Amino acid sequence: ITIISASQTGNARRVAEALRDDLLAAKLNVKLVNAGDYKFKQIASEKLLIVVTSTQGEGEPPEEAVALHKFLFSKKAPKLENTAFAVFSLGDTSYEFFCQSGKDFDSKLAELGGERLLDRVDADVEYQAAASEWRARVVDALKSRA
Numbered sequence: 136i137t138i139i140s141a142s143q144t145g146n147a148r149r150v151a152e153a154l155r156d157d158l159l160a161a162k163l164n165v166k167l168v169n170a171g172d173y174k175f176k177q178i179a180s181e182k183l184l185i186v187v188t189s190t191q192g193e194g195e196p197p198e199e200a201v202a203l204h205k206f207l208f209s210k211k212a213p214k215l216e217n218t219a220f221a222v223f224s225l226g227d228t229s230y231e232f233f234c235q236s237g238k239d240f241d242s243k244l245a246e247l248g249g250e251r252l253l254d255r256v257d258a259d260v261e262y263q264a265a266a267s268e269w270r271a272r273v274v275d276a277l278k279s280r281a
């Protein structure tokens with residue numbers, strides 16, 4: 136399983152660390168990478184992929200995931216021939232573009248034909264219970280979808 140973290144400050148990364156550990160706890164071969172250090176040209180090669188992404192100024196994706204989101208949004212983006220996914224997003228209702236990055240990644244993947252393992256989870260500023268409830272569900276799902 137490949138867990139991708141896209142954080143401007145470092146919160147998605149922390150959740151990803153908790154999540155990867157739950158999967159190390161439930162399975163074992165888990166790879167945790169930051170969007171800035173993932174050779175995303177092989178994202179296709181993933182059987183089970185998780186993305187954790189925050190939403191930034193003007194609803195823009197996290198910096199480390201810009202090339203990735205742009206790539207995933209490019210005419211050169213590959214079809215998720217055999218890739219399934221789940222997205223967790225950190226956002227704030229006070230902003231207009233609440234959780235837009237999650238909406239973007241969730242959409243484009245599905246548009247490309249990726250299989251959604253779990254409905255996208257949008258998280259507000261309190262964030263910490265969503266990551267946990269979401270964490271508990273991907274574990275249950277992945278145990279049931281591998």
Ligand SMILES: Cc1cc2nc3c(=O)[nH]c(=O)nc-3n(C[C@@H](O)[C@@H](O)[C@@H](O)COP(=O)(O)O)c2cc1C
Nearest residue numbers: 143144145146147189191192225226227230233234
């Ligand atoms: C400059 C800035 C702008 C942001 N803009 C938005 C926004 O438009 N919508 C949103 O849902 N979240 C926005 N966030 C994200 C925050 O709501 C919050 O989820 C943050 O803690 C995410 O941290 P992470 O990047 O470490 O995951 C913004 C954060 C920063 C620093």
